């Protein structure tokens, strides 16, 4: 099976994929990613990233209970938080144009737009239509080409 470092490297490439199907009403010069909560696979992200057009993705960790997350970032990578913490996070994001992605595949029921599944041979993901719809960003539907091909041996 795949090692942690292998998976971490893949997670950032999947994230770059997802980002390509997403549009922010006010596109920043630098995309800001916040990592929130304990994570296993964010060490790659946290080195910062570059998109194909050369836009930099700056990444940093932030407290679960920071009330300004909606304002402080364009993207959130959500780690393994509890019911009360998760509610805090998605309350803070409501109203703002933020893309949310969870490290684990259980947060798609509770507010995350995309949920990663890092086990198995490839990284796959699922998405939630309700959360996408209320998000404030636009997500091209082809984003699922990425998930489907990822789930194909």
């Amino acid at each position: 099976r795949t090692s942690i470092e292998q998976r971490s490297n893949a997670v950032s490439q999947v994230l770059l994929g997802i980002f390509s199907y997403v549009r922010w009403p006010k596109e920043p010069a630098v995309l800001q990613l916040c990592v929130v909560g304990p994570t296993e696979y964010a060490d790659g992200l946290l080195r910062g990233m570059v998109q194909a057009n050369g836009r930099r993705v700056h990444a940093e960790r932030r407290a679960v209970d920071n009330p300004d997350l909606g304002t402080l970032c364009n993207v959130i990578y959500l780690g393994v938080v509890d019911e009360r913490e998760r509610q805090q996070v998605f309350r803070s994001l409501a109203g703002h144009p933020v893309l949310s992605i969870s490290e684990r595949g259980t947060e798609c029921s509770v507010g995350s737009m995309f949920c990663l599944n890092v086990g198995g041979p490839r990284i796959t993901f699922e998405a939630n239509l309700d959360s996408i719809a209320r998000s404030g960003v636009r997500v091209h539907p082809s984003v699922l080409k990425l998930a489907r091909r990822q789930a194909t041996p």
Copy 2:
């Protein structure tokens, strides 16, 4: 610097502190640290560290179900794990001289020798005297004066 980044530095400093009160049966030239499980505050550790005595601490992430954790490291820094994952981890550690520190720990009853509480204005930690007693590493008792 975010609060998470400042606490991660503080976590680094607390671990180095704890390390100075710990001795290994056969002392390695390089101290291996494994970060296992989801963590918020290990980014400082993962950049690597050096002990006051000059010894380098090599850190890396390893998987919860890595069966060789006991032989792969001297210190394990343990993140969020469920019951099964915790039991799994400690089975791999059984019979090996491994220092164990968990990032959370509202109980510190079962598992790690030390449990951080990174909350509040300062990092505090608790000791599990049972886990310490049967660990293979020598923990100097002064370290309990640094616990809460």
